[PDB]
Amino acid sequence: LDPMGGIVMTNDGNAILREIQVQHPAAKSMIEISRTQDEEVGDGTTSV
Amino acid sequence: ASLSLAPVNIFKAGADEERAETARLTSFIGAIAIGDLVKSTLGPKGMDKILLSSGRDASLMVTNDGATILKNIGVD
Amino acid sequence: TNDGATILKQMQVLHPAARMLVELSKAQDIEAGDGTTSVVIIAGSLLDSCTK
Amino acid sequence: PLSVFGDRSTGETIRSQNVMAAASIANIVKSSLGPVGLDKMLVDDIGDVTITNDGATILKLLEVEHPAAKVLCELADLQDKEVGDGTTSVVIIAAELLKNADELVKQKIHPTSVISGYRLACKEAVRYINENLIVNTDELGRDCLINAAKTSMSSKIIGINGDFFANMVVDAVLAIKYTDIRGQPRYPVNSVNILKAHGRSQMESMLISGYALNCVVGSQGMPKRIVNAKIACLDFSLQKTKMKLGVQVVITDPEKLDQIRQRESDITKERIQKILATGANVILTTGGIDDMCLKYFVEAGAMAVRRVLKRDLKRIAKASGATILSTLANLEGEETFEAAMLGQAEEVVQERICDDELILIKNTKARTSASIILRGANDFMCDEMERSLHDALCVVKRVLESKSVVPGGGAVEAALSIYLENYATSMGSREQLAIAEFARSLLVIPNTLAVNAAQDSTDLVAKLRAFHNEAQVNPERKNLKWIGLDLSNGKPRDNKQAGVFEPTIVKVKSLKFATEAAITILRIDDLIKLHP
Amino acid sequence: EGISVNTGPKGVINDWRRFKQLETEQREEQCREMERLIKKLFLQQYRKQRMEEMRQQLHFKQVFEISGEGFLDMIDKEIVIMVHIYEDGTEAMNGCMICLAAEYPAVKFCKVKSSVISQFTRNLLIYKGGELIGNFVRVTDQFFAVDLEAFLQEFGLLPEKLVLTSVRNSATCHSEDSDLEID
Amino acid sequence: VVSQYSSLLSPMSVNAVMKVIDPATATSVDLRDIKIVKKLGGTIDDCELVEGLVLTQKVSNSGITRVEKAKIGLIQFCLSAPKTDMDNQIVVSDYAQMDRVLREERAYILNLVKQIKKTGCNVLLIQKSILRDALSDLALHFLNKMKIMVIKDIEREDIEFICKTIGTKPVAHIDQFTADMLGSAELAEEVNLNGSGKLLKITGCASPGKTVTIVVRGSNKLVIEEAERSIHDALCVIRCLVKKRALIAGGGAPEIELALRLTEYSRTLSGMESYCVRAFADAMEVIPSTLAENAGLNPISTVTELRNRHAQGEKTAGINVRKGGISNILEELVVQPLLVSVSALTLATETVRSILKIDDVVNT
Amino acid sequence: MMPTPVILLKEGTDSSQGIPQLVSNISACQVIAEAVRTTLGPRGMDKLIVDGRGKATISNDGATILKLLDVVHPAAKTLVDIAKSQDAEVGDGTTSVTLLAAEFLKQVKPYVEEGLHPQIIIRAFRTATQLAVNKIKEIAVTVKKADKVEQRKLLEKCAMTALSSKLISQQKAFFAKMVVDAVMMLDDLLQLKMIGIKKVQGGALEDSQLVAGVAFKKTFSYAGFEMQPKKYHNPKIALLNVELELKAEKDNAEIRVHTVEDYQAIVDAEWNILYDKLEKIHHSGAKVVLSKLPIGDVATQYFADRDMFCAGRVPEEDLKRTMMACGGSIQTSVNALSADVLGRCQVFEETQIGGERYNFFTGCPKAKTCTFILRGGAEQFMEETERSLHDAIMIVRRAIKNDSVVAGGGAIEMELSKYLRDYSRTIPGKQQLLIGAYAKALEIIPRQLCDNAGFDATNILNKLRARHAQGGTWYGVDINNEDIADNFEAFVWEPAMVRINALTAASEAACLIVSVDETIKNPRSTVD
Ligand SMILES: Nc1ncnc2c1ncn2[C@@H]1O[C@H](COP(=O)(O)OP(=O)(O)O)[C@@H](O)[C@H]1O
Ligand SMILES: Nc1ncnc2c1ncn2[C@@H]1O[C@H](COP(=O)(O)OP(=O)(O)O)[C@@H](O)[C@H]1O
Ligand SMILES: Nc1ncnc2c1ncn2[C@@H]1O[C@H](COP(=O)(O)OP(=O)(O)O)[C@@H](O)[C@H]1O
Ligand SMILES: [Mg+2]
Ligand SMILES: [Mg+2]
Ligand SMILES: [Mg+2]
Ligand SMILES: [Mg+2]
């Protein structure tokens, strides 16, 4: 459930990690890792 | 160096002090006020004063006596 | 800083005699350039003797 | 009786407060020293994350309120500016110097004597370093550069991959070499464009034998690769011509409006016609290009790039031999463009880098230039790679400019401590104590190096001091000057043979700056803080 | 009565200024709050707004949540600054600010509760150059990101509109020491 | 604080004063002829005494630096499109005029640059302008093509100093820009301060002016400001030597001699004024106590020893911090001009007399 | 960290651990020592502390200053505790203990900061302290002569040394002689409660006196008291614990009579009971009557008619002291008032001292007590005089226990430092640095003396070090002569147990502080 009111319904790793707000800097690093994996090759986002 | 006019404060809160000229001024002002209050009640043609008490009793008195006038007033 | 004039001017002193001493240091700086600490110390000592 | 609207701390109170502030600043960064050092994570108020080991970066990002702490932070910044390495060692040395100097002052030693002793000790330390501990790099060949780079990149995110990053750095620095007047070589680091992009591992970081632009071609129509490139560098926008503020168009005969409007764009059309007719293939301009002119560039089969950075354009023009043209005006009052103003590179391509593209101007002639593309796991890792890489580039520049290096791992500090504690017996009576405390303060670096590795700091530093003392006393044991600390095994080691070097300028500038900062803080004995 | 007091207040100028600075801060806060606190107390169906919405999701961070001192000194220093007052239709406003902030890096979207700043609490402040240029109160009467975008562009408060690079290029700005070539 | 860097700064200050005045027929020193330039970075050991002038402005003409046998020209007009003093507009009603406007503006700029170059000028200083553009891009390009190092944004207040140093005469209209108005210099070079900044230095001038420049370097800003203040104090002291050329010992010797002699003088008076003069002498005795203090010396015993030595006849006996005792200080080379002690005494006495004539404070 | 929805400890629990908390503890101990540094030596200065009620406390004693400081730091409370411990066990050295403990901690701080294991430091401290105590016991000077005059001189010199740091140091010889006289009259247990200390405002310090007997303030005389004679030349003193006034015989007693004759008989019976008690007192031959319980007006007048003296409501301690000074027995019953239970003194007098009336019992050859009547200008003046006399009294008692002395003024500290450095020079080297740090820390006392006196501490320390190294055991700081001198020949003497206990307590405090690695502070309960 987005802050904008929309609903993202998926099992893709990158989307799930992208629509989540975190405060711990290590969690931010992990989110950035998910985005990097998605952008570089597009697959294996959950595995990484 | 006066007791009140010194860089270090030597008194409790609210404790005042008045040096020579100020003390003389206050004493003379008080004495003159009292004398002007009681006078005009002097001599065969003196007039009376009305004393309205501020207390709950609100007692009313009219008098020509200096002692009675001075006794029933708030003096500071 | 160690400059007497700079020290005196930098800090607000709020008292008339203190301000006159500050401007004394300024004047000594203008005419001489150094000795700004000595002149203020001398004025203070002179007034200290004036007390007694 | 002062009647000053503000606080006032005097004497031992303010002296101890200043020492407290400096020691706190030191203890902030003391844990990021040496190969067994560890990075720090800085999180701003809005939530940005910065993972770094550089002391200058940490001290710059941190909010600081005490003036002495500000002095040490600015000292680290200055050390970063003038040298580029040792930004943590300088802060640690300065804070230890203040601590020991204040301890001396508390013993009723006058601060002036302490300051004089510090000055004498600093001068003697610099002289002894320059006369005894320096190693000439002439006979060491290329291995000295690689080893200096590897030493500088230890304690960094790219520390383990030093075997590869050091070759990369040395090649990049040697690429930008140039000799100026009066016949000495100068190495203009910061002319190496460092481009970051997450993606593949660190080992896929590329050294471009050319220049790398972080931009894209203007239009999709123009080709993304040109083999024989004739670069034309321009410093003016290519748009419809708009007359200046002092000129206004007033029409009284309506028949002239069409001609006016036609010329309004025909002027730029003719300029581009000249530029393309000279034979140009690649056009880079700092100004913008509107779609009308992009159409000419597409039809001509040439690449046009807009909004190029000024420094990037200057570097491209210098490397390729082109000349920046802010206008098309010759010395006879005409619009023209000679072919001699065209730079040349043997290939200009637009490569895709992790779902993004950038122009790679490869192998420019008339000059060799270098650029570095860093690949990391995420943005934070790439930023730390860039910072450490800049540290290494600065170190290699210092080594190549001044050809003297000194052993690393606290060998210099221990040798200086021994020599200074020996030499202090001859100067004065209280500056004796000052110089002895300077020598003791110099020993904080090996202590911190050892304690960061969870080794026996006391025993290790005692062994190192014994080695250096025996080297200084015994005439024929001068080969023990290079004994430093091996933190991987926790034993003293010949650092000259181990390949642990650093430029002499780092140590010398660090000592001078630390001594001056300590003197500046120590000169204070009263603080007035006016109420805002 | 005619005291013409001599060096009387002089002996207490330190305390007088001690309270003077505090009352100056209090009056600064009061002036900042009160200046707006009570002073105010087919093309027709927007065919293109759906396209603007679907372009808006294509990019994330969050708006800055501010006490009173923070609100004062954020606008006192340093562009258009938008301040949203909320207490807990604020969710829709927050979403609109979140969506608009990314596409307009120049603007300084931020929000702050009214608790840290009783008629105002029960029932959007826009700054520019330290002075209020926006003139909107109770935006509930007159929603998505396109609604706020059109509402602000009607009065011309949103600066006019960027490509996405790899990650970044710049490291520092200082003396050039760029490429040089000498004989 | 720069007491450690004294062997470098004392001769620097003396030379700075002696290079801006005539040794004879000089009764004052204008300290505004000694410009102090502060540049962060380095240490105080890097302070310099540049003979020419140092400009913080950067060279607009990138790529050309360090011109030798420079012929500096300083202009006060603007190198841009023509613009009259009163409001002017150009009306275009035909495309021919539309092209001719650009053509003629280019021709005008080219003629300006050609006239400037014809005089042999190779360094150009341009005064700062706020109304119209002082240096257009076309003008800069033309000047670069002619190999002229262009320097813009020169402040208005610095014109007098620049003209006094280099020898350039300002030019306000191109009709008057001739070779005679050019200040020939040996070298005009732009240098970098080891990554801490860029300084523009014009060293070596035919017929140099009576100005010098002191460049102060330091590791932090605060020590730089204090070094500037200390250098200013040294220059002011040398100026105090220039006017009222009289030298006396320092180290508290004049103060203790004043105390002793004034006590003796007060013995010869009578009444309350004798008491006042004796108190004046006792107050003068303070400075030797302060000098004895702050040095680890016993103040009262040191002052008594000084007074005894002066009564013995040693006018130059003073406090010796190096030896931690009392000795002749002229052997320690501790001297100060007479117009420091005299000025301090006179000003302090004036202020005391002024304060003593005050009996009330009124708040407005 | 992570939120951990259900946390381990209570919310708000504060925990600090590692080297930083140890360094913080050392710094806190430094602060506590600095709070009392300037009170050490003959040049020491007093400290004034105002409580929350506005009452001031001008003091020089280190233990008193530390107690008046509301120290809440867990590590810093150890210094206050060891100061109080030294005050209780010995009575002097309450500043030296804190200075030594803080100096030990400061000296080991550099070694702590580099990761040295605290157990090593603790072992080094224990070894150095036991060696130093053995050395003190070895080199302490004792006189095995059983000479009473020599012992008295030793006690007077020790008391003078103990006193020459307080505001009564100007009259230190007079006060020390008086204190030595006071203590020598205690019999075998030297109980402090047997030495009364009375403070009377007004009068110079030299007007203070020691009473060879007992003296106490007049206690609420009733009507008819002024008719009693106020001087007796061989009185017999009746020490009683008896209420002499008309009152109910018992609280639960009730009288039930049904005849007016019985009513009159009961009234006369109460009167006869009181008069029988008074007559039994009078026929005992006593002339002075002191009672713990109130003595009524009827008894006062009865005694006045018989030329007797009465004083009721005498405090219990004063009655016990009168017992021990005169040689009687406190009687709760007057039925058997023999001559065995009656006190005796040469002279009793009721004189005036500075606006107060005092009863004096002098001329008691068999007295085992005394009384100090201190005169001063202010309440805090007499309080601090009492504190100084307490320090001197404890020193004299401890010296009575054993006449083993060492020279003061840092002489013993310098000798111990030299010995410990010499020992540390002959050990492998990890312990050598720590024992050398201990020895260097032992030099704080002469350094603090010089700093307080305004000396140049470094030169005095160098001279002392050279003198001790080249031979000379009792060389310490000479305050008046700006220099060093043989303190033993200068009669700067202290009992050895003072330094022994100081070293022991300082070492224990330092070891306890170093041994702690973590501090945990639970959230407060019932703050209200
Ligand atoms: N039919 C299957 N049987 C067994 N393993 C499978 C099958 N399909 C996929 N997998 C494995 O399961 C994993 C699925 O990962 P996936 O959900 O695609 O992660 P991501 O979305 O991050 O790529 C892959 O590693 C793949 O090897
Ligand atoms: N391989 C190594 N072995 C031993 N010591 C090293 C090694 N590499 C670096 N050092 C030492 O570690 C110290 C700390 O370096 P570092 O803190 O990373 O540089 P900076 O001070 O610029 O941050 C340097 O003084 C260096 O001598
Ligand atoms: N006449 C004296 N000269 C020098 N030092 C003295 C003299 N008398 C006492 N001292 C020193 O003063 C110290 C005691 O100071 P004080 O504050 O009185 O008690 P404490 O032992 O509690 O500090 C002792 O160490 C002693 O050596
Ligand atoms: Mg998948
Ligand atoms: Mg001076
Ligand atoms: Mg480094
Ligand atoms: Mg004592």
Side-chain angles (χ1 to χ4, degrees), chain A residues 12-13 43-47:
Chain A
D12 192 276
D43 206 22
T45 312
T46 302
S47 308

Side-chain angles (χ1 to χ4, degrees), chain F residues 260-289:
Chain F
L260 184 76
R261 293 319 171 199
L262 279 187
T263 293
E264 291 197 3
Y265 176 54
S266 76
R267 295 274 163 74
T268 65
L269 296 175
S270 45
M272 281 145 301
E273 72 170 346
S274 84
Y275 297 136
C276 297
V277 176
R278 178 71 168 276
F280 192 100
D282 291 346
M284 300 312 325
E285 213 175 28
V286 169
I287 307 279
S289 300

Side-chain angles (χ1 to χ4, degrees), chain D residues 85-86 152 156 391:
Chain D
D85 205 31
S152 290
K156 299 299 201 263
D391 276 7

Side-chain angles (χ1 to χ4, degrees), chain D residues 54 84-89 151-156 391 395 502:
Chain D
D54 203 55
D85 205 31
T87 70
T88 307
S89 310
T151 308
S152 290
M153 306 208 276
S154 291
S155 75
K156 299 299 201 263
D391 276 7
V395 165
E502 40 191 12

Side-chain angles (χ1 to χ4, degrees), chain G residues 61 91-96 161-166 391 395 494 498:
Chain G
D61 193 75
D92 194 23
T94 61
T95 315
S96 314
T161 296
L163 279 179
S164 67
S165 164
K166 314 289 192 287
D391 277 0
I395 284 296
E494 302 159 29
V498 187

Side-chain angles (χ1 to χ4, degrees), chain D residues 261-506:
Chain D
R261 294 155 67 86
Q262 195 56 247
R263 281 301 293 169
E264 216 175 0
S265 81
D266 281 16
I267 290 157
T268 318
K269 178 180 78 71
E270 288 150 1
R271 290 213 204 94
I272 292 147
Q273 289 266 270
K274 278 164 196 153
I275 300 275
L276 292 169
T278 197
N281 264 324
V282 191
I283 294 90
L284 323 170
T285 176
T286 42
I289 310 187
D290 44 352
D291 306 350
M292 195 203 54
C293 312
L294 293 171
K295 290 324 167 294
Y296 298 95
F297 286 121
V298 172
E299 301 290 343
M303 293 183 286
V305 187
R306 48 172 162 200
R307 300 305 180 193
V308 182
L309 285 195
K310 186 60 161 309
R311 55 174 178 82
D312 275 338
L313 194 44
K314 285 203 285 223
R315 283 163 196 169
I316 289 158
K318 182 62 65 68
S320 49
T323 62
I324 309 284
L325 278 194
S326 56
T327 179
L328 291 191
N330 46 14
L331 290 186
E332 56 270 16
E334 294 296 331
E335 307 275 326
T336 198
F337 186 89
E338 291 89 4
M341 323 298 257
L342 293 175
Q344 279 172 49
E346 66 94 20
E347 203 196 18
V348 169
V349 311
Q350 168 157 320
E351 291 222 336
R352 215 183 45 82
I353 301 294
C354 184
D355 205 71
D356 268 316
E357 278 181 350
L358 55 88
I359 294 93
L360 283 174
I361 306 161
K362 288 185 178 180
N363 200 294
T364 58
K365 69 181 291 294
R367 177 104 180 99
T368 48
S369 62
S371 290
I372 279 168
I373 300 192
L374 298 170
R375 317 302 309 279
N378 49 29
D379 311 322
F380 319 139
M381 183 166 166
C382 288
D383 283 306
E384 191 36 40
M385 301 185 48
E386 179 207 55
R387 286 182 221 107
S388 162
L389 194 69
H390 182 263
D391 276 7
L393 291 151
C394 278
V395 165
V396 172
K397 158 191 204 160
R398 301 309 168 189
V399 165
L400 273 166
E401 288 181 344
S402 76
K403 299 174 181 182
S404 58
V405 294
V406 296
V412 176
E413 269 77 42
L416 272 193
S417 84
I418 297 298
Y419 164 75
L420 282 180
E421 79 178 5
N422 183 22
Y423 154 82
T425 65
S426 57
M427 311 335 297
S429 199
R430 282 158 138 70
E431 46 197 4
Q432 293 194 23
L433 290 168
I435 298 160
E437 283 291 86
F438 194 101
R440 271 191 58 254
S441 303
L442 280 192
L443 272 164
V444 65
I445 293 305
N447 276 119
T448 315
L449 292 188
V451 73
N452 269 8
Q455 309 265 342
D456 198 323
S457 163
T458 307
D459 279 338
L460 216 59
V461 176
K463 291 178 198 157
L464 186 62
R465 275 178 56 87
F467 270 124
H468 280 265
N469 182 24
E470 192 277 331
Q472 291 199 12
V473 174
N474 190 328
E476 67 266 15
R477 303 279 283 282
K478 298 324 206 306
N479 58 272
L480 303 186
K481 305 183 299 181
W482 331 114
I483 293 289
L485 284 199
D486 177 24
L487 278 300
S488 60
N489 299 291
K491 48 178 54 180
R493 181 186 57 184
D494 193 296
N495 273 351
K496 180 165 182 299
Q497 182 261 322
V500 181
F501 303 119
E502 40 191 12
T504 318
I505 193 66
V506 186

Side-chain angles (χ1 to χ4, degrees), chain D residues 74 82 110 248 333-335, chain F residues 42 90 103 106 221 294:
Chain D
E74 299 188 294
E82 287 213 8
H110 201 276
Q248 166 197 5
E334 294 296 331
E335 307 275 326
Chain F
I90 304 176
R103 163 165 304 283
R106 175 191 325 129
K221 296 183 290 294
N294 314 337

